[PDB]
Amino acid sequence: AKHPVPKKKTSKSKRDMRRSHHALTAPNLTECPQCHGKKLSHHICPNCGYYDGRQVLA
Amino acid sequence: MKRTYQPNNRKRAKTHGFRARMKTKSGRNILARRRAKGRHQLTVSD
């Protein structure tokens, strides 16, 4: 049992305009509460370990 | 279940195993049909 084989292909031309509707979101937004610079999307260090107060640990 | 062969080769000793082509003289040449006949080693001792 085989469903219509490949035949025609899609090398160049196409397979180009396919790294843009996704790619990677591109970031570099924030740089930590106070010291140094990590932070993530709303999330404390591991440096000083804090958004503004006591947490995590060096 | 049963395959098509399985181990135990007695009928490849005193029949068709090394020295069993004398019982059948015109099998001696058959034994000698790939040793003293053409190139290659043999097929009963790898």
Partner: protein, 130 residues
Amino acid sequence: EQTFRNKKQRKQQVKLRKPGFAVAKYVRMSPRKVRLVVDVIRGKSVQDAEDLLRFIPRSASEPVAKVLNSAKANALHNDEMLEDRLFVKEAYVDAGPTLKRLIPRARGSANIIKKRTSHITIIVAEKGNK
């Protein structure tokens, strides 16, 4: 106006080896996805290259970046350059030694796969700005 005549030199007299070099080969992730973690780092090495590739919600810093600075391990003082410098002009890769292995599939006559492999390429030599 460097050299031309006497082609037994550039064979005998040349010193050095090849400034840069760090490529550990193998890679194990297609010459198509290698570039995917190099076509983002068009600037600042293990500065805004690392974390850009170190911290990236997956696995692509180990033998991706840890070898990408194996050049630096040699650029320690075995290779040229500096620290507050370095560049890497662009990026390019290829395939490499593989190994027939497979694991039967099903239908047809036979199944035919390839373990696939690459060649990382990691260099830090001929620069620009200072």
